[PDB]
Amino acid sequence: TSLPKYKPQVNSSINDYICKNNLKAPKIEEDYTSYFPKYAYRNGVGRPEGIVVHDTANDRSTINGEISYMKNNYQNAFVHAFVDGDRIIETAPTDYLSWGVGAVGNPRFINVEIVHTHDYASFARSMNNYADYAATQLQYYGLKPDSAEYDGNGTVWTHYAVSKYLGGTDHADPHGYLRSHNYSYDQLYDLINEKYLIKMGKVAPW
Numbered sequence: 001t002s003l004p005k006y007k008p009q010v011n012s013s014i015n016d017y018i019c020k021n022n023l024k025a026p027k028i029e030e031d032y033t034s035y036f037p038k039y040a041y042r043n044g045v046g047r048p049e050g051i052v053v054h055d056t057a058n059d060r061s062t063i064n065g066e067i068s069y070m071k072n073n074y075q076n077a078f079v080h081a082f083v084d085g086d087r088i089i090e091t092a093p094t095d096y097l098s099w100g101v102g103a104v105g106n107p108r109f110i111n112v113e114i115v116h117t118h119d120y121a122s123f124a125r126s127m128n129n130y131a132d133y134a135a136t137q138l139q140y141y142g143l144k145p146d147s148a149e150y151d152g153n154g155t156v157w158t159h160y161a162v163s164k165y166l167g168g169t170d171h172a173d174p175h176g177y178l179r180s181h182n183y184s185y186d187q188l189y190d191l192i193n194e195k196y197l198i199k200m201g202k203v204a205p206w
């Protein structure tokens with residue numbers, strides 16, 4: 001008796017495209033900085049409670065440019081990783097917090113930024129890449145996917161949901177950005193869930 005194929009819970013032609021074409025996320029590359037702070041989550045080092053979906057709100061920057069700026073501006077903001085259509089770059093260890101979502105969410109969640117992309121295929125790859133990175137973290141930390149968007153409880157959050165339910169911040173990403181590419185947070189969450197289940201050996205790989 002073989003593993004079942006995951007049945008999508010959120011209709012998504014983009015996720016259908018990603019799956020049908022067996023898109024492979026790239027390696028997770030480190031690019032750490034010696035002077036970034038190494039602060040515990042509220043429950044300890046190595047104790048994130050979930051992960052946040054952000055987007056850069058910048059329609060012109062590249063992943064390299066975002067990282068260069070952040071290395072100089074980390075006292076204002078920094079995040080754990082960036083993804084684009086080509087790369088997944090982890091800029092801070094997930095065992096310590098990052099300064100990406102305000103004083104309430106930072107002690108709880110891994111912060112990951114989606115760099116803006118400018119064609120259909122690269123956007124799709126960037127969603128696959130976010131989802132693969134997120135599912136990797138959830139599996140590594142033993143955190144089952146649970147979306148917080150509509151109840152303020154779970155392991156996968158948007159910046160918007162942190163603003164809405166937790167406070168400490170007032171940003172609304174990533175909903176408007178994903179909508180502009182004919183996608184949605186719930187489509188992304190469904191992809192994260194599928195990849196988590198693949199990594200857990202519960203559903204069939206692509």
Ligand code: NA
Nearest residue numbers: 147148153154
């Ligand atoms: Na929930």
Ligand SMILES: [Zn+2]
Nearest residue numbers: 054159171173
């Ligand atoms: Zn954000």
